[PDB]
Ligand binder design. Sequence first.
Ligand code: BCB
Ligand code: BCB
Ligand code: BCB
Ligand code: BCB
Ligand SMILES: C/C=C1/c2cc3[nH]c4c(c3C)C(=O)[C@H](C(=O)OC)c4c3nc(cc4[nH]c(cc(n2)[C@@H]1C)c(C(C)=O)c4C)[C@@H](C)[C@@H]3CCC(=O)OC/C=C(\C)CCC[C@H](C)CCC[C@H](C)CCCC(C)C
Ligand SMILES: C/C=C1/c2cc3[nH]c4c(c3C)C(=O)[C@H](C(=O)OC)c4c3nc(cc4[nH]c(cc(n2)[C@@H]1C)c(C(C)=O)c4C)[C@@H](C)[C@@H]3CCC(=O)OC/C=C(\C)CCC[C@H](C)CCC[C@H](C)CCCC(C)C
Ligand code: HEM
Ligand code: HEM
Ligand code: HEM
Ligand code: HEM
Ligand SMILES: CC(C)=CCC/C(C)=C/C=C/C(C)=C/C=C/C(C)=C/C=C\C=C(C)\C=C\C=C(/C)CC/C=C(\C)CCCC(C)C
Ligand SMILES: CCCCCCCCCCCC[N+](C)(C)[O-]
Ligand SMILES: CCCCCCCCCCCC[N+](C)(C)[O-]
Ligand SMILES: [Fe+2]
Lengths: 52, 258, 332, 273, 323
Amino acid sequence: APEDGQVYELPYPKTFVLPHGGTVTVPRRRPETRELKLAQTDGFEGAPLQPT
Amino acid sequence: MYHGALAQHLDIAQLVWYAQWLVIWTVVLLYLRREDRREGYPLVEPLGLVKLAPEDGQVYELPYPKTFVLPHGGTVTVPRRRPETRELKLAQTDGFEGAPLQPTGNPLVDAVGPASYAERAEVVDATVDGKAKIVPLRVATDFSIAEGDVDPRGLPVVAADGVEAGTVTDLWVDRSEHYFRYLELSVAGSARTALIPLGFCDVKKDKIVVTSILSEQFANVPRLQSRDQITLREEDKVSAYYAGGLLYATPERAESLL
Amino acid sequence: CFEPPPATTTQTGFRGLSMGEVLHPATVKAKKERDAQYPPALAAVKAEGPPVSQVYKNVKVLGNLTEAEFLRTMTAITEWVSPQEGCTYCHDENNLASEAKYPYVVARRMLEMTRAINTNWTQHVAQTGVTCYTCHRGTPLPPYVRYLEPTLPLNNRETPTHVERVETRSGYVVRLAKYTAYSALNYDPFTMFLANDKRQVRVVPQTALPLVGVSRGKERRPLSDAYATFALMMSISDSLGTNCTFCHNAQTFESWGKKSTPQRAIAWWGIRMVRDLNMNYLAPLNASLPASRLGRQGEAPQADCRTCHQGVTKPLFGASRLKDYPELGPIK
Amino acid sequence: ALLSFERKYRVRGGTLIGGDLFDFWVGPYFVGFFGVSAIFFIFLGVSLIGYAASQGPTWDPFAISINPPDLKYGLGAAPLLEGGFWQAITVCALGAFISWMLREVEISRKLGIGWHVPLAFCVPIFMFCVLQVFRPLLLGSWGHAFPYGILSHLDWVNNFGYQYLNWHYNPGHMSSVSFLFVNAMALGLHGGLILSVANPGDGDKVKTAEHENQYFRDVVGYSIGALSIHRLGLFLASNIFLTGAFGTIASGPFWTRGWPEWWGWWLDIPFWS
Amino acid sequence: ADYQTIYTQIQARGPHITVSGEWGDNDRVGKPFYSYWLGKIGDAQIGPIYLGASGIAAFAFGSTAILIILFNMAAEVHFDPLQFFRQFFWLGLYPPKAQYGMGIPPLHDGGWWLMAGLFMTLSLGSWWIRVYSRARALGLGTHIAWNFAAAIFFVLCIGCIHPTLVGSWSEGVPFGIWPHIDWLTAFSIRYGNFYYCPWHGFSIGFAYGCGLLFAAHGATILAVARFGGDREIEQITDRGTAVERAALFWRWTIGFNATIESVHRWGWFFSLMVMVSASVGILLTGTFVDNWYLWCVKHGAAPDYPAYLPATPDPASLPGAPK
Ligand code: BCB
Ligand code: BCB
Ligand code: BCB
Ligand code: BCB
Ligand SMILES: C/C=C1/c2cc3[nH]c4c(c3C)C(=O)[C@H](C(=O)OC)c4c3nc(cc4[nH]c(cc(n2)[C@@H]1C)c(C(C)=O)c4C)[C@@H](C)[C@@H]3CCC(=O)OC/C=C(\C)CCC[C@H](C)CCC[C@H](C)CCCC(C)C
Ligand SMILES: C/C=C1/c2cc3[nH]c4c(c3C)C(=O)[C@H](C(=O)OC)c4c3nc(cc4[nH]c(cc(n2)[C@@H]1C)c(C(C)=O)c4C)[C@@H](C)[C@@H]3CCC(=O)OC/C=C(\C)CCC[C@H](C)CCC[C@H](C)CCCC(C)C
Ligand code: HEM
Ligand code: HEM
Ligand code: HEM
Ligand code: HEM
Ligand SMILES: CC(C)=CCC/C(C)=C/C=C/C(C)=C/C=C/C(C)=C/C=C\C=C(C)\C=C\C=C(/C)CC/C=C(\C)CCCC(C)C
Ligand SMILES: CCCCCCCCCCCC[N+](C)(C)[O-]
Ligand SMILES: CCCCCCCCCCCC[N+](C)(C)[O-]
Ligand SMILES: [Fe+2]
């Protein structure tokens, strides 16, 4: 599932044509690929992470 | 050179592939999936002590309201906020949200689970020209039982428990569709009739067999306000009653089949 | 109207593609037994004495045979083609060099044709080769031949019903259907494809997009060409008692490489071969044949795939007499 | 989480097997014993597909193909990579389908409605078995079943048809196709009518049951009626496979010639030959 | 069990109903009568039927089309009656076998085909008017007329728009039982395997989907027949336990659900899209794609398999190979 709601809440994409060349389009899928040195301090979702 | 070529690699049929997919998901998500939400939305839940929100998502997923102008006067507009105000005799069997509820009284009478009706209009469904649509043959006199079929008027009704529960007294016909929808019976040892929808009825030559409920439970079949008329909400009540028998007529019936 | 299991099935393509033969055992056995009537090789004779070119009066083709060899060939020819009639079918009783009877002169050309097939069309017939028996099957008129019209029954040893008679116009669509494996394809693949080399069998494009300049209006071949190629392939399939996947991966009929089996490339040669035979040996024999032999446009009976194969992927199930009768080729 | 009307329906009971143990919902989904097994099998089958797919020459969606064993392995077990995976995935698919079917009976039971839907769902499960199980069994080899690939499964359908020269003349297919076409038309008609009545246009009134019937009496001289069009529709759809199955089973085990030729039983009645 | 979902146990007879339209009410010709056996699984009243101008027009054109087909078919068995009846399936009326381009073909080579094609078209037009009108007369929306339009358009696509687009009448669909079937294979072969045409895939998707959806819908309604679920119009304007239960069955099974109205929209849409996707596929074929398999190969979609028997070079390309 892509939830219906995830579709409904987004706007249509917009694209800035950049001044020194290029474009950028937002919204766009931008995952954080970087590995993070953090640990679940506790169990639940609201729990803060802790640097390892 | 080629018909269809647009670039080093781009051809018409290739771009129509994409257009075809956009057209499909647009219609499906933005149109049909919202038409799907004209009943039952917004979703109900508890909330918190301090919480201000119509969620944006609850707005986004709904369509604009539509209004049917009804044939014999009135309008109906959907979607619309339609809370279930009725008190329900059910209890949390367990803690979590996914847990099933359990009747605390008589589910057939409390009308819960398979015995629930909808909050339909207390209006008599009408034929196109304004008459009451579903009426006993005592009333629908230009109507008849096709030559060949059983006339159940006079036959015993026999309940799930093998016991005779009453005597068929009339059939109610659908005058818009020329189609019987209930039998009416004199309840044995009661001073009442009950209607029973024709789908709960095995019609034999010599008896009408009804397995949903035991003979004892015809006593509490829902009662109509008139004798020769029935409202939309009443039909729901009568039907749901027997449907509830399938799960609830005896203690075995809710449990594992095997 | 059905055939009881089991069915014999083979695999001719990568697994999961549903490519291969589906055979009914009783049918295969029945053809097996029919093809089993191939007379065996006459015993070999010792090569004693003069080439019959010295010895006999009028030997053109087999002139280099010693006498005993030559007479062995004549005995074989007689049991392959005209066993019920004996030697006199082609010969004058009292003069063996007489070309008086047309079977004689036809048989001479047939010796040349036969040696052509085994020498020049090894890419089709390979080291199995053919003999007079392959087509004739022990009668002068081979049981499966083609005219410039569809004719019925396919086996001419059978007797026509009224409707089957080529003259009976109302039986045409049936004559055509039984030649194309019971389809309604309104084309005769024999006169279109096999009688000569005028038409092209391939109809499917080899580019994804339509090439500008062959793709519009009168530039383009009519779709009827596609039906004809389909008709020819129905007929080829019925002739060899097989189905398309013997030769094609239906994923892409028009591709070769891994999309075609070796039997397809062999079938390609057989088409070239059949055209050669028809154009250069068989169609000319209308000059030497009785009117009773000729079709309604004065054509000699000619050859298609069935003439040899007669319902089997290899004629006579691959039986061969090539080593036994090298007279008949290959001629080095 | 709940539809506005839903809560009154969320009662215990109706399970086939398991009782209270898995009688609950996760979100909108009822679980039940068979939801647990459905999930078990999906996860299994899908894991097998991922591995099998990684062992092969592509991660392109359209080109990925997981194929049955060579004919020679017969009805026996084939090495994992040469059909073994396909045999495994076939067992998981079957377990997923039947679980899904049985989970639907439990849902029907809890709701107090008829079991017609899981019943209707048996028809496609059946056809899946005709193609993958029965027909391979009659022919003696798992290798006759179809590959699991988006496009490759179309190459199998193609070749299977052309094995019988022209599959279009297969009388079981003819019946099958006819029901596919009628059923599509009828769904258009039924959908269109119910919408035409509930949505007359402008600000006109919603119409009636009497109108629905009048429309088709007018257009074609007959109207089957409201309940009956749903019974007809379940019938036309179901026969797409129930008739088709005969055409599929007959090909190979009962008929080895081209399908056009089968029509010889007609053409060659000797009284008009 | 609910036996009513199998058949009508006790049939009702009552005086027949007539819903007055804005016009043409005088054209309803015929006496209703009642089949008892039909009444077991449907409404028992057969008839009356509306005539009208467009309907009559439709029957006129349609019958003319049929006369040209059957007359040419009779010509094919040389007007033998028994051979006609015997060979009927195999008999056909064909388009140009020769390439006349967009030239009007001779009568003997596709001329009659084009004629019958024209009358059939007028026949479909007239019928469309009838199907559209009756809705308007009776105060109904025109959803059916629009689903029908898509279907007619498809027929035009395979009948003359594609032939026109590529500029040859040779490509149209024969009339006849086996002949219109053979065309399917001729056309797929010519265009490089229709399995590799995306819109062929779309169309089948929606066609299978109509099967799924009408199986699931028809079943869903019989399963709540006990609650009057068949009375779909008033279940729309006044939701009842029928369609509350129908919705919840589907929600609990697949996680989302329609309403009793929207499910007909899904159905309609799926139906429509069979014909729409089909048309698009035909408009693209020959015009812009010549070999659908190669087009897939060009775009990377096609599966490929190992050789099983040895890979076989095209003999025609071998050096020294004949022609
Ligand atoms: C692109 C694909 C094509 C295709 C593919 C195809 C295949 C692959 C097959 C057929 C088959 C068939 N096709 Mg072909 N086809 C046919 C006709 C036919 C039939 C001979 C047959 C069965 C069809 C069927 O059951 O439909 C469904 C039937 C319907 C919708 C009938 C409507 C009934 C109506 C609602 C009843 C109304 C009630 C009464 C009138 C009441 C009367 C009482 C009143 C008067 C008081 C027509 C007439 C046309 C066109 C366009 O004119 C057409 C186009 C095409 N076919 C395309 C070229 N066709 C099958 C066959 O057997 O071939 C030999 C088959 O296997
Ligand atoms: C060259 C080959 C040809 C061919 C070969 C062919 C074969 C070999 C067979 C058919 C069959 C069939 N063909 Mg034919 N065909 C058809 C139409 C049809 C179907 C009506 C019918 C049944 C399909 C089927 O088995 O589904 C099967 C569908 C199944 C089993 C669905 C299973 C679903 C499962 C229960 C659940 C799956 C769940 C997903 C995994 C879940 C995903 C989860 C996601 C969504 C969350 C048409 C309309 C045409 C036209 C217009 O030409 C045509 C042409 C041809 N067919 C060609 C001539 N066709 C079959 C038949 O019945 O023939 C008589 C058959 O065996
Ligand atoms: C005998 C003939 C057969 C046949 C003939 C056929 C043809 C000729 C065509 C398809 C097409 C399709 N087939 Mg195949 N088919 C498919 C699935 C598919 C889809 C890839 C696609 C669209 C189907 C559709 O929309 O249906 C209606 C169902 C709907 C709308 C509900 C949504 C279903 C969802 C799209 C299914 C998606 C399944 C996933 C891709 C499968 C993988 C599942 C994951 C979890 C592992 C399944 C799951 C099965 C099984 C399990 O039996 C099956 C069996 C068969 N198909 C038979 C072998 N099918 C079309 C295609 O485009 O091919 C690529 C097409 O052209
Ligand atoms: C070997 C040949 C193949 C082939 C060739 C083929 C072609 C050439 C075409 C299709 C098309 C289509 N095929 Mg494919 N096909 C299909 C299924 C389908 C359909 C979904 C779709 C056609 C739409 C349709 O409903 O026509 C039936 C519906 C029709 C004809 C509408 C008729 C409406 C009309 C108003 C009715 C009029 C009735 C009147 C009574 C007429 C009166 C006439 C009188 C007056 C003479 C399946 C399910 C399969 C499988 C399972 O293998 C398959 C295999 C194949 N097809 C093979 C690959 N198929 C079409 C397509 O989608 O291409 C993109 C197409 O044109
Ligand atoms: C004649 C009647 C018909 C009919 C009827 C009904 N149809 C139903 C019902 C009824 C009545 C339901 O009640 C049930 C349902 O819930 O509806 C929403 C259902 C459903 N019809 C689906 C697909 C569908 N119906 C098809 C055909 C017809 N339906 C015919 C036409 C086709 C065709 C034609 O291709 C498809 C693909 C699913 C969406 C759904 C099952 C979900 C499932 O079972 O979840 C359980 C399983 C999964 C979600 C995943 C399983 C994955 C396995 C382990 C791994 C994959 C294996 C696989 C073999 C790979 C092959 C891929 C390759 C070929 C490419
Ligand atoms: C995806 C959706 C699809 C879809 C949709 C829709 N399909 C519709 C509608 C919708 C929505 C309608 O509204 C319209 C209709 O009205 O429905 C009741 C209709 C229709 N779909 C028919 C056939 C069909 N749909 C097919 C396919 C699909 N449909 C696809 C699948 C197929 C296939 C599969 O091949 C077929 C064969 C007809 C029943 C009907 C048109 C009648 C016509 O156009 O008549 C034209 C008129 C004539 C032929 C008149 C001549 C007839 C007489 C008997 C000839 C007598 C000869 C004699 C010599 C003279 C004596 C005269 C006598 C009186 C003394
Ligand atoms: C049957 C066993 C048989 C005999 C006997 C026979 C003999 C024969 C001889 C001796 C010759 C050479 C005679 C001469 O000087 O020309 C000869 C030549 C040919 N034959 Fe013969 N023949 C017998 C049978 C048959 C049959 C059944 C046919 C016709 C199908 C046939 C044909 C021919 C032909 C032609 C020649 C010429 C061969 C050449 O190399 O040109 N014979 N025969
Ligand atoms: C092999 C060397 C050989 C001989 C000998 C032979 C003879 C022959 C005769 C006698 C005829 C005329 C028959 C008649 O009465 O008209 C004849 C005719 C045909 N043949 Fe033959 N034939 C030999 C070999 C072959 C081979 C290998 C083939 C098939 C490729 C073949 C085919 C035919 C056909 C066809 C005819 C013409 C039709 C006819 O006149 O009967 N023959 N052959
Ligand atoms: C089975 C009925 C069948 C079909 C279908 C079929 C089709 C087919 C096509 C579409 C072509 C054209 C290829 C192109 O346009 O490039 C074609 C060509 C050849 N075929 Fe075929 N074919 C069917 C069956 C068979 C069988 C059983 C064999 C092998 C014995 C076979 C062989 C060939 C050959 C060779 C060609 C090429 C013709 C040439 O180049 O002259 N086919 N086929
Ligand atoms: C007609 C155009 C025709 C076709 C097609 C055809 C095909 C064909 C195939 C596919 C093979 C190979 C089969 C295999 O399993 O390897 C094959 C083999 C032979 N053929 Fe043939 N053939 C056609 C026509 C003809 C004709 C007219 C004759 C007889 C003159 C003939 C002969 C043969 C022979 C001999 C073989 C066998 C080769 C072997 O290895 O045994 N064919 N044919
Ligand atoms: C003149 C110029 C320049 C341009 C005109 C362009 C034009 C409009 C051309 C149109 C061509 C068209 C529309 C061609 C379409 C062809 C197609 C789609 C044909 C398809 C199928 C044909 C079939 C199956 C024919 C079957 C056989 C028959 C007609 C025999 C009679 C049988 C009956 C009618 C059965 C009736 C059964 C009924 C009573 C229930
Ligand atoms: C269980 C079904 C048995 C087949 C009944 C055949 C009924 C004839 C079909 C006419 C359909 C007419 N319509 C769509 C106007 O209602
Ligand atoms: C190939 C035909 C494809 C048809 C697409 C069918 C869409 C199925 C419905 C998806 C609904 C998904 N949801 C809940 C996220 O909205
Ligand atoms: Fe409906």
